[PDB]
Amino acid sequence: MIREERLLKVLRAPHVSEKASTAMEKSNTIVLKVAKDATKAEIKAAVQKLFEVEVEVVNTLVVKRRSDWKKAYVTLKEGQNL
């Protein structure tokens, strides 16, 4: 299933973009910069271990720019740290 060196690389940054603020304060959901491959199953596995929170669902999309950057919307349960 997992090898930790991959979880440490599957996430690349947090992402701040106004709808990223409204994703949290309205809809218990955090917005991330993830690997150019990744997959939703790995993105959930990375957040649930690095950030110690339960995850409900992960949805993904891309900026359509030269570096083809993968955004992830990770929805949490009820309470969160950051």
Residue numbers in the entry: 1 to 82
Sentences reproduced from the published study:
A large fraction of cellular proteins likely start to fold cotranslationally in the ~100 Å long exit tunnel in the ribosomal large subunit, before they emerge into the cytosolic environment. In E. coli ribosomes, portions of the 23S rRNA and a few universally conserved proteins line the exit tunnel, Figure 1A. The tunnel proteins uL4, uL22, and uL23 consist of globular domains that are buried within the rRNA, and β-hairpin loops that protrude into the tunnel. These loops help stabilize the tertiary structure of 23S rRNA and contribute towards the unique geometry of the tunnel. uL24 and uL29 are located near the end of the tunnel, and a hairpin loop in uL24 forms a finger-like structure that partially obstructs the tunnel exit port.
The E. coli strains HDB143 (uL23 Δloop; uL23 residues 65–74 deleted) and HDB144 (uL24 Δloop; uL24 residues 43–57 deleted) have previously been shown to be viable, as is a strain where uL23 has been replaced by a homologue from spinach chloroplast ribosomes that also lacks the β-hairpin loop. Compared to WT E. coli ribosomes, the tunnel volume increases by 2,064 Å3 in uL23 Δloop ribosomes, see Video 1, about 1/3 of the size of ADR1a (5,880 Å3) calculated by the same method. The initial model for uL23 Δloop was built with Coot, and improved by energy minimization in a solvated dodecahedron box of explicit TIP3P waters, neutralized with chloride ions and using the Amber 99SB-ILDN force field. Even after minimization, the backbone of the new loop formed after the deletion of residues 65–74 still showed improper geometry and Ramachandran outliers, so we used kinematic sampling to model alternative loop conformations, and then we selected the loop that could fit the electron density and had the best Ramachandran score. The additional space available in uL23 Δloop ribosomes makes it possible for ADR1a to start to fold at 3–4 residues shorter linker lengths (Lonset). Assuming an extended conformation of the linker segment (~3 Å per residue), ADR1a folds ~9–12 Å deeper in the exit tunnel in uL23 Δloop ribosomes than in WT ribosomes.
